[PDB]
Amino acid sequence: MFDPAEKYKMDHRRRGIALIFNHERFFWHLTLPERRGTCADRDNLTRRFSDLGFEVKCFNDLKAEELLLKIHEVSTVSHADADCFVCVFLSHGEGNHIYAYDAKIEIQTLTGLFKGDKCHSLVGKPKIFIIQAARGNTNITEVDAASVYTLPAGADFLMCYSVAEGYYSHRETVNGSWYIQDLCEMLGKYGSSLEFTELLTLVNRKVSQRRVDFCKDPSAIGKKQVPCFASMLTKKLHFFPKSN
Amino acid sequence: MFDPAEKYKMDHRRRGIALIFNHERFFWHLTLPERRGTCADRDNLTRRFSDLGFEVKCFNDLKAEELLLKIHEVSTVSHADADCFVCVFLSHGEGNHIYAYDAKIEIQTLTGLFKGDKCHSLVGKPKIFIIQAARGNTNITEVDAASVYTLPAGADFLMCYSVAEGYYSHRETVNGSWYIQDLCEMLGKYGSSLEFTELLTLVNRKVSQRRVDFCKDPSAIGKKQVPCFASMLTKKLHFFPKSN
Ligand SMILES: Oc1cc(F)ccc1CNc1ncccc1-c1ccncn1
């Protein structure tokens, strides 16, 4: 009965929710820099995910408690009538942690709320996390060292990462993160036609190909960016237009 | 002219080398169990990779020095005339380490030898690592806890993992590892037709779907296996049959 071309069923009434936690500033006593440009990331993502049928819900500079409450809320609501779930972190991170405004949170505990154990309505449905996080140091290009582990999650999770270990994350202070720029461009051109990992692969090409030989800053030279993704998907994932 | 359907060029004279480091026993003073069944993994892989045009080269129970010498050898030979490179570890691991016979080796240092910097002949060519490693506990099913970090590598690397964090790796003592059985079956049916990550996705479905409710051992119940992969590929990867 088994089928090599099998797709996730993307014919539910609604596409689903895209959460976007967007962190620009941080509590003084953490000594983390402003992520100038993250608002371009937030806006570009919000548009592209809207266009694919997502109920996008942004949240600027939440503290740990607020963030946990919001994501727990979304986990316990029924996704019975939904194709999939997307969650995006634009912040600083270290190891297995993302930074809220006031403290770091274990990525494991955020992804764990959708494990299908904990959230029955999303069993057998794609759960995509996109993470644009790294180490805190007119349109300048600021450069952070990779810091967030390229963790997997569980069955039917796709974890997507701005940068792999050893490489470097770039953010233009007006245009935003290189990862998110190229992601959003490819979503723009291909989101509705291409399989999502085929697209994520295009993003890897586009970001790896960005030249870093002749740079305005002398010490940003030879700092290449290579993003990855960790698939535990079990079927092809397409965001074909849902019919009106 | 940027192209969403673009493929790695797989028209070089030879397909390339598949290394297989296969560890069954270990130095007494490490206190690691025999991996009974790993020979089925080694043989099944050897066949399937042969059939796709690979010069397969197996190495049973090498010590650290021997293993490093062998893999460094293969890194410094010219791959100019080759499509790609495959390297497979069947052993125990912990964190960012694989076990040789006598001691553990940093996966980073093994994958590092093929980073475009260090190995010019493989720049722009797929470098696939397949890792069937976990924590040391007629045809019995032995069950190990996930232990090896699902690390990325660099540009044009595909890292493939038996099991993700939190889940469990299964090995039948005659048929071999669940990961490798389902990988080899899918290679058998689809290797030559399907795109390789499409296939790795089928392997994720097949392994996640293995029932663990009614088990011979009482304490092996509810121990699910979900394998992942970390793509930093930049093009589609096909193993179409080569002529002559
Ligand atoms: O993925 C697994 C699998 C396990 F069995 C156990 C733990 C992890 C955590 N993942 C990581 N993934 C990718 C890069 C690094 C880590 C990392 C690195 C340093 N410390 C902790 N983690």
Residue numbers in the entry:
A (entry chain A), B (entry chain B): 30 to 166, 187 to 293
Direct quotes from the study:
Here we studied 30 congeneric ligands that each present a distinct heteroarene for stacking between tyrosine residues at the dimer interface of procaspase-6. Complex X-ray crystal structures of 10 analogs showed that stacking geometries were well conserved, while high-accuracy computations showed that heteroarene stacking energy was well correlated with predicted overall ligand binding energies. Here we employed a congeneric set of molecular glues for procaspase-6 to study diverse heteroarene stacking on tyrosine side chains under physiologically relevant conditions. As a model system, this protein–ligand interaction exhibits desirable features such as a shape-persistent binding site, a conserved ligand binding mode across diverse analogs, and the positioning of the probe heteroarene at the terminus of the ligand structure.
To confirm that binding poses and stacking interactions were conserved across analogs 1–30, we solved procaspase-6 complex crystal structures for 10 representative analogs spanning 3 orders of magnitude in measured KD value. Importantly, all 10 structures revealed binding poses almost exactly analogous to that adopted by 1, with the probe heterocycles positioned in apparently productive stacking interactions with tyrosine 198A and 198B. The significantly improved KD values in the progression from pyridine to isosteric diazenes (1–4) and finally to triazene 25, for example, was fully consistent with guidelines from the Stahl2 and Wheeler16 groups that increasing numbers of heteroatoms lead to more favorable stacking with aromatic amino acid side chains.
